């Protein structure tokens, strides 16, 4: 109905992926070799500008949703509505617990398999020494 | 044909020649502002002299540099700009040279400074490998071979001017579990019954190998194995010569060399 | 048994362990006795044993917290971490501040090093030493890099004039940041050197505190905040032709470098055509408000005269196979041009004025028709018939213009009557008159 | 027919002698200046009025400037065109030279399309 | 090479240098037509009042302000307005036992000061050995400070002597 | 710290974490793993500190012998500036790793004395290092040093 | 309002990120004539373009750290749906690559059934 966390989560992650965007397109542009190619007639340079256009829609829509989730965010203005900045310095859940513990009984299954499989897995270094 | 760059200096010699006599020039319209103890501008007017000298000095090495130039200009390349105006629209065929040549090395400094990244976190084909290896192989004085009689895995060496061959086994794209070492000691060509590992030496090249343990560990890119490898080859290629040893004597030890930052250097000292 | 360590130095002090053998009643705990040495052909100078053998034993035991072998890491790890702090405090000892063994706050747990009274330079010093003292803030040093060689250096001042906006707007100037790295085990010269420098700068920092008569009219725009560089960009409508000044200790002189900030902006937009000019007339006086007058006065035309094509050579020459060029940017003064065409006829026109600018002959050389300039084909036809065509018998004195520079400028498709017979290019009047 | 590198080396010395001779006869004007304001009726040798030297010194480095820039720009072309073409000077056909050149022009142009439409988005 | 214009200007060395005016500025008027000079408004004034006339030096409160919070201090009545501009009370509160307090009156920022000098040292150091002990190992480490600092180094030296008290 | 070993049967291990520094180990022998993971929490604060402002490079491996360093020789300690405060932590073998330092500018206890008689009242340095008692935090994983870090401007 | 403390400005965090970002490229895309020489100028252009980009990025993030964290001590109920949304999540992907991992060393242990005829 909110999710006001996992909205500053992704508009977080939106505008890492737009950094890492402009780098991944600057990479990309940085060999931008000569159209006229001497060999190459028309492979290259179709295949850069198409994968330059995707990326320029790319970021163009990260601007988009980063205006979304930044006007959604601002405009929410649900709970404390002074906002203490200076109440960051210090001197039910059961169904979260639950689910805690299944996951921890899965991860304790799963890596008991695991360890089954580490044996079953190395399988070579025994008998490398005659093999073939 | 680099011979821009000392022609650009000559600008700028002959531009600053131009300025200092000019100042020179003007500052001799007055005397001392306010003194009120001596006549201590001589100081001045001494280094505007040498300054002077310094521009003819640096006139007369100029002149003594850049012998002369080819001929045939523009090597006939431009002839077609050189035509008439009836196929020549020419002048934007330099002009997207220029734009060209600026938005590269413009992406080229972005990319560079940009080595800085604010990514907090990275979350949301046995074709490459002979490729990989095909492309550094075209580099000179650096032999390299692979057999893989392993399996999947990926076996291969590589060589020097010497005779101190290197055993590289890794996976498909990044490098690991290398070792190394020197004049046919290993031998690795049908050691005992085939291409051996043995992971020996004769206790010296040890050093060297934990240097390219630790290299691996260092050049180790998130993406990009052919970047990885080719920085790799680039460290290795460092020790073709292992005769210098700064920031020391060329006596410290058995041996001096530690460049994962591309300059060597005496050491156990790092 | 004995130890070293390289991180501080080749071999400037060993550190020899022994254990204190035949223990009272104890087939066991030696006591592993400690001993350190400063010896310098190796020398074998005194060792005094001077730290604090053997009581490292009852203060550990008077603590309030299997090998106990960290007593010795303990040891080698303080050596190792105070011998580069205690090399740069007695080489510092010589110019002013000798504080020995200062902490930051003690909870850091980290050696220290302060500066107090830092030594006068050489540049002005008559007041300008006042106004520094007045803004020197408390300042030190701390280890830098990997550990094992590098130095860095933290400065701080009083209010910045400068301090604009949308840069972490604070009262104080919140930090300045020097980094050193040596090679043998020198820093000092360097710091002298940046500070010799900032010193210079807030000299000329100063002397711009000041209220400019029409400037401000281009709210302030000066938002590219002072670390130890005086930015600003308020010229053209928006951003600018960003100034640059620094000091290279490499020579005497300043580095200027325009600007690219501003997306309304040329390709360059930069001056760099003049720049050189420019940073010795600074270099002259660092009274920046003649920068400032002059670059709004030359960006107009500049930026009128970088439009024609200079860099070809304009095809074959049309005598030989050479090759010539057909214009000649001349940057031999602040404002003064002399443009030719075609390695001749060399056109002199420039601005001088607030608001207007001034076109002349640059081949007469205060000689109307007694002599030459014995060079190049002077007075090309009748070019002052040219310039008063647009200004709204053999010489030519200083006819003056204003936005006609601009219209003389920028080849128009139309080559003056144009009636329409042909031609698919852009002519300049300028071109056409000289062709 | 004369290169502009040799025409540069061979006109340094006159630009050293024309320094030379200004120098000179500003010493000339000078000591005769000094003679006539506090001495007596003795330097009666009309010289140079040191404005000609002047501008003809100005003139020949501005000259020699002017020759540099054009070595310069004339190298700096070369350059680029051998980096960034071929050699094809009639294994190919000067219209597919001039075809070649075309397709890179129009290749530029698109490329500054799309960043004019990436700043147009943008804004 | 060109040395007969410098030694020849060098010459008109007395107070009768002006013709260098008619010399040169014609020429320079003549190349050089530059209205941009001094236009700008600037007036010389090199100083008006420059004093402190408010506190003490600020490079001592300045630095001092900066140490530890394990020291506390304060002043004592006022014989030290306008020279010393320092007389100082410091107590050591940390996980340790106190003394009794210094002086703390400086010098001019030379700073060959030992700014205490234990005007109470006979009885109040007499009263107990170990405090005796304390003081005398405290004076014994004073000597090996060459140009100490009262500011820092004198106060930083105490504060050790008085936690290696212990022993 | 992206270490590498090999295993020994006779021998003991080797290891190389970043420079180099081989070391063996025994049968049972291995609290070097324990002063890594301290050492690499450290770097870890280092490197996100560096990544969002930007303290210096003081983050020595050692200094100061706090707290005897128990826990074979583990011992690491660094601090960070971030504008006009500055945080400060700890690590070691249970040697107090949970180090945290925070202070506002008007605070409860001071010296103003020798000061308050001066003009232009300098809340500016940084006198009391008023830890912060990292505890009860809502710290997940330890790395939120930079979450403590954002309390610079809202 | 240069030496001025007081920073009298608003509408800013939105429009200053397209605003850095078109900056220094709006250099670039140009139909201007381009002086055909020109060396370590528009680098420093570049460098002040990408740092203050970079700088208001931080201020962005760290405004966001501090709301997050504010939030969280003011709704944990919503910092603890989210995590138990991220951890059926990783639950699922776990199950997903073990069934996947599964059906693959089936389908390798079937195919190798009797490789040896004999």
Same mark, same amino acid.
């Given at each position: ?8 989560? @992704? ?109 079953? @897995?190395?399988? @070579? ?8 | ?38 006549? #201590? ?12 000298? $310094? ?24 002839? $077609? ?24 090395? $413009?992406?080229?400094?972005?990319? #560079? ?31 390299? $071979? ?35 070492? #020197? ?67 060329? #006596? ?19 | ?65 299997? /090998? ?75 280890? *830098? ?24 707007? *604070? ?107 420019? *940073? ?18 030359? *960006? ?62 640059? /081949? ?39 936005? /006609? ?31 | ?123 | ?16 240098? %002006? ?115 304390? %003081? ?12 100490? %600092? ?12 008085? %936690?290696?008290?212990?022993? | ?10 021998? !003991? ?40 402002? !930007? ?46 330092? !925070? ?52 | ?118």
């Amino acid at each position: 109905e909110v999710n006001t966390a996992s909205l500053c989560r @992704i508009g977080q992650e939106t505008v890492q992926d737009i950094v890492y965007r402009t780098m991944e397109i600057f990479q990309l542009l940085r060999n931008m070799q000569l159209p006229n190619g001497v060999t190459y007639h028309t492979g290259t340079y179709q295949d850069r500008l198409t994968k330059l256009q995707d990326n320029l829609r790319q970021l163009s829509v990260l601007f988009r949703k980063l205006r979304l989730v930044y006007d959604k965010c601002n405009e929410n203005c649900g709970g404390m509505d002074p906002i203490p900045v200076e109440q960051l310095i210090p001197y039910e859940r059961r169904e979260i617990a639950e689910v805690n513990k299944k996951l921890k009984q899965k991860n304790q299954q799963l890596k008991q398999i695991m360890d089954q499989l580490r044996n079953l @897995i190395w399988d @070579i270094n025994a008998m490398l020494a005659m093999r073939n | 044909s680099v011979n821009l760059e000392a022609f650009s200096q000559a600008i700028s010699a002959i531009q600053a020649l131009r300025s200092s006599v000019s100042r020179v020039f003007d500052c001799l319209k007055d005397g001392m502002r306010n003194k009120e103890t001596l006549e #201590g501008r001589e100081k001045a007017f001494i280094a505007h002299f040498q300054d002077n000298l $310094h521009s003819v000095n640096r006139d007369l090495n100029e002149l003594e540099r850049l012998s002369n130039l080819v001929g045939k200009p523009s090597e006939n390349h431009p002839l $077609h700009n050189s035509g008439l105006l009836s196929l020549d629209p020419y002048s934007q065929l330099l002009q997207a040279y220029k734009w060209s040549n600026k938005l590269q090395y $413009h992406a080229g400094l972005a990319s #560079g400074l940009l080595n800085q990244q604010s990514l907090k976190r990275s979350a949301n084909p046995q074709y490459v490998d002979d490729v990989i290896s095909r492309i550094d192989r075209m580099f000179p004085e650096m032999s390299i $071979h692979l057999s893989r009689p392993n399996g999947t895995s990926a076996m291969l060496l590589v060589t020097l001017g010497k005779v101190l061959k290197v055993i590289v086994v890794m996976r498909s794209l990044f490098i690991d579990r290398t070792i190394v070492k #020197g004049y046919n000691e290993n031998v690795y060509t049908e050691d005992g019954k085939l291409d051996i590992w043995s992971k020996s030496n004769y206790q010296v090249f040890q050093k060297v190998t934990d240097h390219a343990t630790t290299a691996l560990l260092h050049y180790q890119l998130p993406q990009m194995p052919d970047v990885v490898v080719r920085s790799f080859m680039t460290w290795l290629r460092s020790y073709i010569k292992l005769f210098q040893a700064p920031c020391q004597r060329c #006596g410290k030890f058995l041996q001096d060399g530690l460049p994962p930052t591309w300059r060597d250097f005496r050491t156990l000292e790092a | 048994k004995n130890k070293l360590f390289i991180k501080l130095t080749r071999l400037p002090q060993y550190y020899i362990v022994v254990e204190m053998l035949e223990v009272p009643n104890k087939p066991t705990q030696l006591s592993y006795k400690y001993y350190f040495m400063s010896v310098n052909s190796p020398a074998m100078a005194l060792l005094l044993q001077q730290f604090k053998e053997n009581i490292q034993d009852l203060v550990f035991r008077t603590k309030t917290g299997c /090998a106990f072998n960290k007593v010795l890491a303990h040891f080698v790890a303080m050596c190792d971490t105070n011998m580069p702090f205690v090399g740069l405090r007695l080489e510092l000892s010589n110019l002013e501040i000798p504080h020995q063994g200062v902490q930051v706050e003690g909870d850091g747990f980290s050696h220290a090093i302060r500066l107090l009274k830092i030594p006068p330079c050489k540049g002005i010093t008559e007041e300008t030493q006042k106004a520094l003292d007045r803004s020197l803030l408390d300042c030190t040093f701390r280890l *830098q890099g990997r550990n094992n060689r590098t130095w860095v250096a933290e400065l701080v001042f009083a209010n910045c004039p400068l301090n604009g906006t949308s840069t972490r707007e *604070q009262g104080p100037s919140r930090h300045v940041y020097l980094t050193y790295e040596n090679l043998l085990s020198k820093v000092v010269e360097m710091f002298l050197n940046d500070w010799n420098s900032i010193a210079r700068l807030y000299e000329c920092v100063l002397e711009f505190a000041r209220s400019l008569p029409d400037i401000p009219a281009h709210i302030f725009s000066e938002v590219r905040v002072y670390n130890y560089r005086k930015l600003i960009l308020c010229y053209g409508t928006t951003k600018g032709s960003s100034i640059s000044i620094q000091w290279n200790s490499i020579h005497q002189k300043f580095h200027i470098s325009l600007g690219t900030v501003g997306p309304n902006s040329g390709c360059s937009n930069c001056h760099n055509t003049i720049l050189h000019q420019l *940073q010795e007339m600074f270099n002259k006086t660092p009274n920046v408000v003649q920068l400032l007058q002059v670059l709004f006065d030359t *960006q107009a035309p500049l930026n009128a005269i970088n439009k024609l094509p200079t860099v070809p050579m304009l095809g074959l020459t049309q005598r030989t196979n050479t090759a010539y060029q057909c214009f000649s940017i001349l940057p031999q003064s602040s404002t003064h041009i002399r443009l030719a065409f075609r390695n001749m006829y060399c056109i002199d026109i420039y601005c001088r004025s607030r608001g207007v600018v001034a076109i002349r002959d640059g /081949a007469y050389s205060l000689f109307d028709n007694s002599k030459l300039v014995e060079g190049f084909y002077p007075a090309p036809g009748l070019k002052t018939f040219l310039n008063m065509f647009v200004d709204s018998r053999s010489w030519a004195a200083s006819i003056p213009t204003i936005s /006609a520079l601009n219209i003389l400028l920028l080849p128009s498709p139309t080559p003056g009557l144009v009636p329409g017979l042909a031609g698919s290019y852009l002519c300049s009047p300028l071109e056409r008159f000289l062709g | 027919d004369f290169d502009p590198v040799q025409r540069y080396k061979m006109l340094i010395p006159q630009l050293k002698e024309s320094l030379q001779t200004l120098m000179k006869v500003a010493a000339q004007n000078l000591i005769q200046n000094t003679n006539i304001d506090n001495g007596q009726k003795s330097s009666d040798g009309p010289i140079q009025r040191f404005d000609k030297c002047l501008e003809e010194f100005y003139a020949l480095c501005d000259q020699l400037e002017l020759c540099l820039r054009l070595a310069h720009e004339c190298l700096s072309q070369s350059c680029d065109s051998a980096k960034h073409s071929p050699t094809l000077v009639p294994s190919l056909p000067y219209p597919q030279y001039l075809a070649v050149i075309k397709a890179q022009i129009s290749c530029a142009k698109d490329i500054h399309t799309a960043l004019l439409d990436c700043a147009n988005k943008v804004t | 090479q060109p040395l007969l214009d410098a030694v020849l200007a060098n010459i008109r060395s007395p107070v009768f240098n %002006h013709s260098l005016y008619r010399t040169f500025v014609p020429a320079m008027t003549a190349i050089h037509g530059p209205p941009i000079t001094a236009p700008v408004v600037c007036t010389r004034k090199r100083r008006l009042e420059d004093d402190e006339r408010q506190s003490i030096p600020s490079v001592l409160q300045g630095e001092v302000a900066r140490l530890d919070p394990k020291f506390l201090v304060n002043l004592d009545p006022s014989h030290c307005s306008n020279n010393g501009t320092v007389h100082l009370i410091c107590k050591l509160d940390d996980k340790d036992l106190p003394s009794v307090p210094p002086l703390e009156l400086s010098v001019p920022a030379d700073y060959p000061a030992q700014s205490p000098l234990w005007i109470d040292r006979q009885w109040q150091y007499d009263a107990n050995p170990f405090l005796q002990s304390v %003081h005398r190992c405290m004076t014994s480490r004073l000597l090996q400070l060459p140009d100490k %600092h009262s500011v820092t180094a004198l106060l930083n030296t105490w504060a050790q002597s008085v %936690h290696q008290a212990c022993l | 710290s992206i270490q590498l070993q090999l295993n020994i049967g006779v021998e !003991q291990i080797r290891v190389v974490h970043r420079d180099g520094r081989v070391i063996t180990l025994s049968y049972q022998e291995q609290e070097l793993q324990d002063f890594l993971l301290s050492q690499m929490s450290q770097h870890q604060v280092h490197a996100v500190q560096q990544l969002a402002w !930007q303290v210096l490079s003081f983050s020595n491996h050692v200094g100061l012998g706090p707290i005897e360093s128990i826990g074979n020789a583990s011992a690491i300690t660094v601090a960070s500036p971030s504008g006009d405060y500055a945080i400060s932590v700890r690590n070691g073998p249970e040697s107090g790793s949970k180090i945290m330092v !925070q202070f506002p500018r008007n605070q409860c206890k001071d010296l103003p004395k020798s000061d308050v008689l001066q003009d232009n009242k300098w809340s500016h340095l940084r006198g009391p290092f008023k830890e912060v008692q990292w505890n009860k935090m809502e710290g997940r994983n330890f790395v939120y040093k930079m979450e403590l870090l954002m309390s610079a401007l809202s | 309002a240069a030496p001025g403390a007081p920073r009298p400005s608003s509408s800013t965090l939105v429009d200053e990120l397209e605003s850095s970002f078109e900056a220094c490229f709006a250099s670039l895309v140009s139909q201007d004539y381009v002086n055909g020489t020109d060396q370590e100028e528009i680098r420093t252009g570049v460098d002040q373009c990408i740092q203050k980009f970079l700088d208001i990025a931080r201020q962005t993030e760290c405004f966001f750290l501090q709301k997050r964290l504010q939030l969280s001590v003011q709704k944990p109920e919503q910092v603890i749906k989210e995590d138990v949304s991220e951890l059926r999540n990783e639950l699922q992907r776990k199950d997903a690559l073990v069934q996947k991992h599964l059906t693959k060393l089936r389908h390798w242990q079937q195919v190798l059934e009797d490789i040896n005829v004999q």
